[PDB]
Amino acid sequence: MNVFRIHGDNIIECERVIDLILSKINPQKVKRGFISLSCPFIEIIFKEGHDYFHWRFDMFPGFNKNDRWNSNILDLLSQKGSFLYETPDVIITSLNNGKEEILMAIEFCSALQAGNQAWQRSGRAYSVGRTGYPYIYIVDFVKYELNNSDRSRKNLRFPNPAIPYSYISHSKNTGNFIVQAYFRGEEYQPKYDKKLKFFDETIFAEDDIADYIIAKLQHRDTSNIEQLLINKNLKMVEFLSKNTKNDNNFTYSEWESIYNGTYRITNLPSLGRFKFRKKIAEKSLSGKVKEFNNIVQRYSVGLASSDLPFGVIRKESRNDFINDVCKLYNINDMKIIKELKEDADLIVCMLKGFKPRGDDNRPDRGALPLVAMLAGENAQIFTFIYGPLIKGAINLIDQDINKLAKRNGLWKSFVSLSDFIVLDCPIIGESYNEFRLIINKNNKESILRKTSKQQNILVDPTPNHYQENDVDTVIYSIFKYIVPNPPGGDWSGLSIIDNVHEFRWLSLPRVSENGKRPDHVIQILDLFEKPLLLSIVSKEKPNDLEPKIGVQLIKYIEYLFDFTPSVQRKIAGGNWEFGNKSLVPNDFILLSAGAFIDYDNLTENDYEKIFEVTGCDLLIAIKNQNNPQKWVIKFKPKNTIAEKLVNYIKLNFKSNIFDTGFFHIEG
DNA sequence: CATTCCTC
DNA sequence: GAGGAATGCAGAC
C-alpha cells in the first residue's frame, strides 16, 4: 500500500483532488473515514487490468499561518527555495520512510482573470516553481463576471498573452513543470459568445490533468503527459495573441520564436517595434514621476506589450538612460553610478505599489514574479515605486529593508527580485516626496540562495486545537458522504437538481442586501414532498455565529431565486447550457443551520439564546472525544421541520463506504 | 478576495 | 473600446 497526504486550505479543496483521480480511476473497493479527528481519508483499491493498486489518501484541511498543525507542510517548499509567503490551494505528498515528500502543488482558480488580477497570484507560481516541485494552476475557462445588482453578465475579459506564457518560460528556466491548465467552465458557450469563435477546444485539460496526477502517484514517467499540457498552455498563448492588436503587442510568431529557443525574450530581432510606455493615472502623479516616465519612454523597448508595467532598456542605451536618471534626481556619487551602469540589459518595472492610505496593492505582489518568470530571476531589474508610503515604511527602508520585507508581502516581492529599487514616493503626513535609490544587488543575490532549515516533515494528524476547519470537515463529511446524487452548493456555486435537470448559479457574491453566502447548501429530496435546501454556516465557537446569520442564509438563497440560474443541464444527457427557466422558492423547503464546537458549556437557556440571536433552524454542536477518538454530534432543532431533518440524519447515519464508527450522535 | 477607474 | 491602473472590503489575528 502507498499512502498520500492531501494538504489543503479546506476539505472542499482536498476533495477536488480526489474527484480528479476518481474521474479516471474506477475503483473496485472504496472506503472512507477518519485517521484522526481532523483528518478524513479515502482508501481505494483499483486495477490496471491484472495490476492491482492500494492507495490511501489522508486529508489535512487548513494550512498553518505550529499555529494549527504541529509542523507546517509548507516548510518543505521554503526548504527548496520558495522564499515568498505563498500558499497553494493543495499540496500532494507521498509518505515514504516515515516522512513526507512533495509530489506536486495545485492551485484552483474559478475564472480566467484579466488585467492586473491575472498576475496577482503569479508569486505562487514563481516561488513554488523555483523549488523543483511541480506547480499546476487549474483555471475554469470561462466564467462571466456579473453585475451583482441584477446578475447580468459583463463582457469577457482575457489576460495578456504574456501571463499564460510566463508559466511555460518559468518551466524552461527552472527545469520544473509549471503549467496553466484550462478546464471547461459551465459558462463556456461558444455558440453565443463571438469572443470564443477562435477557441481551440483541445486546450481543455480535464483528462490530461487526471492522467498526470495518477502517473505521478504511480511514480511513472510524466515527460509525455507534461509535453501535452505545455502544448495546451502554448495554444492558449496562440488564442490570446492572435486576438490582440499586433502593433503594440507580441504576435504569435514572436512568442513561438521564443518558445522554440530561436531567440530569448530580450534578444528578439523585432524588439523595439513598440516601446514600453507605462500608463500612470493623473491622480497618482507626484514628485518627478512624470519626468522619470519620460526618461523611460525615451530609451525603452516593449516587453510583450507596450502597456505592461515593465519593459527593457538594452545595454547599448543603458548608459544614456542612467545618465538621465542621475541628472533628474541629482545622483552625483561615482560609486552609485558605476553600479547602475553595469553592461547588461535592464528590465524596468514601474509600479504604484500603494493605495492612497499607504496600504499595499495586492496585484503588484505578482508583478516582479511575472518578470522573473518571463526573463529569469537572474535578469537585472530596476523597480520604480511612486505610491504613498506610511512613515513607518520609509523608516524601515532607511533602517533595515529586510525587516520591512519580512512584515509585508509586497515589500518581500520587491526586495527579493529587484537589483535596484527606486522610490519617488509621497510620505503620509509629509508635504513632499522621498527619493531613494537602493542598490539591492547583493541582497537580491543572497535572497535567491535563502532556504529554510532542512528537516524531514511528518505532519501529526492531531492539531494544537480544533476550530472552524474541523467543524467544516465534519459538516462536509456528514452531509456529503454519510447521509444519503445532488451536488448542493458551496462558495463556488449553488446547484439545484430535479428529475430531469441540474440548475446552477455561478459567481456567488459574499453577501447580498439581506443575505450572507452559506458555507454549504445541502439538497435532500427523499424527506419531504418538496426538496429541502439546508444552508449551513460553520464557526469555531457558538458566539461566533453573528446576529441573524440563520435568517441571512435563507435570504441569500431567496436572492439567487430572484434570478434565472447561470447555467443548466439535463442530468441524463449533458452539456451545460445557459439558464433558460427561473426557479420558484415555494417549490422548496429552506432551512438554516449553525455548526460549532462546544465542550458541554451550553445550557437549555444558552441554546434558547443562540436561536434567538441567530435565527437558525438547526444547531449542530460538535465536540471531540480523545479516548477513543470520536466526534460527538448533538443536533438541536429549533422547530418541528428541523426535528424531522434530525430524525432523517439519525436514520440515515449508516453507510457502506463511510466508517460511521468515528461518530457518536447523541440525538 | 474582487470590482471599478483611467489611459492610450 | 481595450486593458492595465487603481481601488477597498473582509476575516483572522
Next chain:
DNA sequence: GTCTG
C-alpha cells in the same frame, strides 16, 4: 490596528 485573500 495590520496583513492577506
